[PDB]
Amino acid sequence: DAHKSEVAHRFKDLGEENFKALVLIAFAQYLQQCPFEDHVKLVNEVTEFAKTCVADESAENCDKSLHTLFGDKLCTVATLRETYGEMADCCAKQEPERNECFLQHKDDNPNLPRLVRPEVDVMCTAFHDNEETFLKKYLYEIARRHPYFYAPELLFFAKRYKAAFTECCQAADKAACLLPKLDELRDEGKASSAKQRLKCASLQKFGERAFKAWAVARLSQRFPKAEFAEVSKLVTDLTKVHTECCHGDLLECADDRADLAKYICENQDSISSKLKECCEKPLLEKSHCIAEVENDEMPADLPSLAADFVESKDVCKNYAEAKDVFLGMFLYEYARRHPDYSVVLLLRLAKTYETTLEKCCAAADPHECYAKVFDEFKPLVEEPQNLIKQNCELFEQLGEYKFQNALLVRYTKKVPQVSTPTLVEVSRNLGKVGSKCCKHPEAKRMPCAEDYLSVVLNQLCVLHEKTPVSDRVTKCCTESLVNRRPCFSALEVDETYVPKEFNAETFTFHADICTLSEKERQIKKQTALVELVKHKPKATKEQLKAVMDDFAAFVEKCCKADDKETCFAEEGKKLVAASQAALG
Ligand SMILES: CCCCCCCCCCCCCC(=O)O
Ligand SMILES: CCCCCCCCCCCCCC(=O)O
Ligand SMILES: CCCCCCCCCCCCCC(=O)O
Numbered sequence: 001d002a003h004k005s006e007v008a009h010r011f012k013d014l015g016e017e018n019f020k021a022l023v024l025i026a027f028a029q030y031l032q033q034c035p036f037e038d039h040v041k042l043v044n045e046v047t048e049f050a051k052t053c054v055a056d057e058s059a060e061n062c063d064k065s066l067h068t069l070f071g072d073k074l075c076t077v078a079t080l081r082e083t084y085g086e087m088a089d090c091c092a093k094q095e096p097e098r099n100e101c102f103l104q105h106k107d108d109n110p111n112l113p114r115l116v117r118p119e120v121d122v123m124c125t126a127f128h129d130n131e132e133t134f135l136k137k138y139l140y141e142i143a144r145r146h147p148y149f150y151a152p153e154l155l156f157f158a159k160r161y162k163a164a165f166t167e168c169c170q171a172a173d174k175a176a177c178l179l180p181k182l183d184e185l186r187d188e189g190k191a192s193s194a195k196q197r198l199k200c201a202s203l204q205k206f207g208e209r210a211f212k213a214w215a216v217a218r219l220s221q222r223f224p225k226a227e228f229a230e231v232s233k234l235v236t237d238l239t240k241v242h243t244e245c246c247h248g249d250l251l252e253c254a255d256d257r258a259d260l261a262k263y264i265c266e267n268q269d270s271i272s273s274k275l276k277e278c279c280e281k282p283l284l285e286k287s288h289c290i291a292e293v294e295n296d297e298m299p300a301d302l303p304s305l306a307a308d309f310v311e312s313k314d315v316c317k318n319y320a321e322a323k324d325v326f327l328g329m330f331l332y333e334y335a336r337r338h339p340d341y342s343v344v345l346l347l348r349l350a351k352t353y354e355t356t357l358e359k360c361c362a363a364a365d366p367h368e369c370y371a372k373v374f375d376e377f378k379p380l381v382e383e384p385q386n387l388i389k390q391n392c393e394l395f396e397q398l399g400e401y402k403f404q405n406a407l408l409v410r411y412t413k414k415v416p417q418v419s420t421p422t423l424v425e426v427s428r429n430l431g432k433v434g435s436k437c438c439k440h441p442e443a444k445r446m447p448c449a450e451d452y453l454s455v456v457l458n459q460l461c462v463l464h465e466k467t468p469v470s471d472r473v474t475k476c477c478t479e480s481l482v483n484r485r486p487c488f489s490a491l492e493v494d495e496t497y498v499p500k501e502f503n504a505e506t507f508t509f510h511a512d513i514c515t516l517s518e519k520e521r522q523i524k525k526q527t528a529l530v531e532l533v534k535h536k537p538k539a540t541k542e543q544l545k546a547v548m549d550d551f552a553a554f555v556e557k558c559c560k561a562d563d564k565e566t567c568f569a570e571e572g573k574k575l576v577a578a579s580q581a582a583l584g
């Protein structure tokens with residue numbers, strides 16, 4: 001593929017709207033400090049040129065590559081040295097040194113102030129009176145604050161925001177319609193950003209063979225009709241894409257992703273029937289659509305796994321030939337038969353098979369050792385399926401909020417060293433995971449759980465590893481991504497914990513609670529419970545339930561009477577002393 005102008009060629013394939021979006025994101029992930037209206041100029045300056053070249057590729061500078069045009073344009077920026085400093089020094093570099101120089105001088109935390117959400121009225125009003133300026137500003141604002149976030153992915157999110165505004169701004173109780181959707185998108189925004197980063201860290205730390213294992217597992221579930229060769233092909237293609245995107249070049253990453261889809265949509269018949277709609281969709285959309293594609297039908301009359309991977313003298317031979325191609329096959333075969341399983345569960349099986357196979361092989365006669373490998377799998381399978389039942393049962397009894405509280409207590413006792421604000425949010429978000437996935441039938445519970453659990457455990461591990469307080473959490477966090485959730489599951493109640501000293505103000509409450517969002521109210525209620533538990537690790541549901549119900553009664557009482565503030569302090573003082581006796 002070669003065009004005289006690539007800038008002319010890109011302008012057409014993407015379409016001007018997507019084109020004017022990306023360029024804005026592009027120049028916003030670099031030049032995070034420059035004001036909006038400047039970028040808007042720059043965007044338009046590019047966009048004019050882009051059009052000059054669309055009209056005639058022979059036009060001057062149209063021939064020059066995106067990498068050259070983009071770089072030249074960045075060096076055009078006046079006050080580049082005043083604000084961007086060493087980034088300016090990049091301009092004396094000749095491509096591809098200069099482009100690499102730019103990537104290096106991205107700032108992952110520009111110390112920009114928190115992006116504050118206006119009131120619904122203000123947004124809808126601005127949205128109406130100025131749609132583009134409204135939407136682009138925030139696109140700009142998000143892209144500069146998140147310079148490594150994959151630009152197309154950001155764009156897909158921006159078009160969803162537009163949707164929520166368009167629907168909600170027309171209706172009554174817009175805030176009721178809108179605020180949910182805006183949080184939902186934000187939560188997803190973080191999840192996406194974290195999931196992207198988790199893909200790159202895993203590849204760096206645990207390596208590429210690990211990466212591919214995770215990939216084989218996942219694709220074999222996604223594409224059960226495909227042969228091991230074809231999975232294996234796609235796994236090696238997919239890893240390379242990740243390896244280019246983790247470096248952080250957008251164009252290269254995008255081209256690799258586009259290529260990988262191009263291939264997939266040509267060989268649909270070889271992979272999955274579910275690709276048809278995705279492949280019709282436009283290029284940016286196609287890559288996204290493949291990633292999210294439904295699992296294909298698992299072929300019927302599938303042979304038992306105990307034939308090829310047990311009951312076969314050649315296994316010890318074949319394992320040795322290629323430890324990874326055989327193991328990979330086993331994973332492929334096990335996985336395509338188990339879409340109901342979590343990716344990490346399948347790796348625990350493959351890992352087990354390998355450990356068994358290596359130890360068994362070259363010792364005595366192998367058959368007698370490798371005979372019971374499949375039995376070793378059953379305990380591993382049961383453990384995560386047990387937890388789902390136990391948790392989804394308790395969830396259905398208690399309901400989300402109360403479930404979050406059951407969680408809060410449990411975890412505080414295990415890891416009291418963790419900051420209250422972190423204990424709350426993790427316990428809240430875990431509530432949401434069981435809320436979402438317990439609604440699924442027995443199948444798809446684990447794959448649902450895994451993906452949602454990964455984000456929460458990552459949020460915590462990312463947040464904790466900046467300010468560590470627990471060796472037990474650190475161990476889990478810096479452990480293999482296969483063993484990460486089991487480690488957390490394994491955490492036992494720490495007997496060594498010296499309780500938190502009482503403080504009145506913590507357990508003091510004001511009438512402000514009465515008029516407050518339930519979430520905000522819950523957070524503070526929830527906060528007190530954590531503090532309560534940190535004070536009294538030797539508290540027990542029998543004793544704890546009492547105190548929680550008296551607090552339930554203390555709050556409904558004062559918020560009901562006319563002079564709430566007096567009640568709150570005076571009743572609280574009773575509530576404290578009473579409870580303090582009840583827990584000691
Ligand atoms: C990637 C999204 C670009 C367009 C966003 C439209 C405006 C979003 C609402 C204003 C800021 C919301 C902040 C937040 O949700 O935390
Ligand atoms: C993209 C396939 C290979 C990925 C191998 C590393 C996986 C790291 C953990 C990913 C957690 C998020 C799960 C997901 O991708 O939906
Ligand atoms: C830090 C240099 C590597 C750049 C990799 C870019 C693509 C993966 C990361 C995207 C999410 C960034 C999250 C973060 O680091 O805060």
Ligand SMILES: CCCCCCCCCCCCCC(=O)O
Pocket residue numbers: 150153196222238241242245257260287288290291292
């Ligand atoms: C399941 C098959 C996936 C085919 C699509 C290619 C996915 C490669 C991901 C490259 C990094 C993009 C980061 C993101 O998800 O925003």
Ligand SMILES: CCCCCCCCCCCCCC(=O)O
Pocket residue numbers: 206209210212213216324325327328331347348350351354480481482
């Ligand atoms: C760091 C966590 C993941 C480590 C890998 C655990 C599973 C072991 C078997 C790996 C199979 C390799 C197959 C392949 O790469 O083609």
Ligand SMILES: CCCCCCCCCCCCCC(=O)O
Pocket residue numbers: 342344345384385387388391392430431433434446449450453485486
């Ligand atoms: C705390 C919320 C509970 C929701 C249900 C999930 C229970 C944990 C089981 C996780 C199994 C998938 C991950 C893994 O294989 O380790």
Ligand SMILES: CCCCCCCCCCCCCC(=O)O
Pocket residue numbers: 387411414415418423426453460485488489490491
């Ligand atoms: C700091 C909070 C730690 C959260 C750990 C969550 C582990 C996955 C949930 C599965 C249920 C087991 C919980 C546990 O044993 O701690």
Ligand SMILES: CCCCCCCCCCCCCC(=O)O
Pocket residue numbers: 507525526528529532547548549551552575576577579580583
């Ligand atoms: C022993 C010191 C005084 C303790 C006062 C009560 C502490 C627990 C308050 C938070 C738990 C209530 C949550 C709820 O029932 O919704």
Ligand SMILES: [Co+2]
Pocket residue numbers: 009013
């Ligand atoms: Co093209």
Ligand SMILES: [Co+2]
Pocket residue numbers: 128
């Ligand atoms: Co109007």
Ligand SMILES: [Co+2]
Pocket residue numbers: 244252255256
């Ligand atoms: Co490439």
Ligand SMILES: [Co+2]
Pocket residue numbers: 288292
């Ligand atoms: Co998506």
Ligand SMILES: [Co+2]
Pocket residue numbers: 448
């Ligand atoms: Co789901």
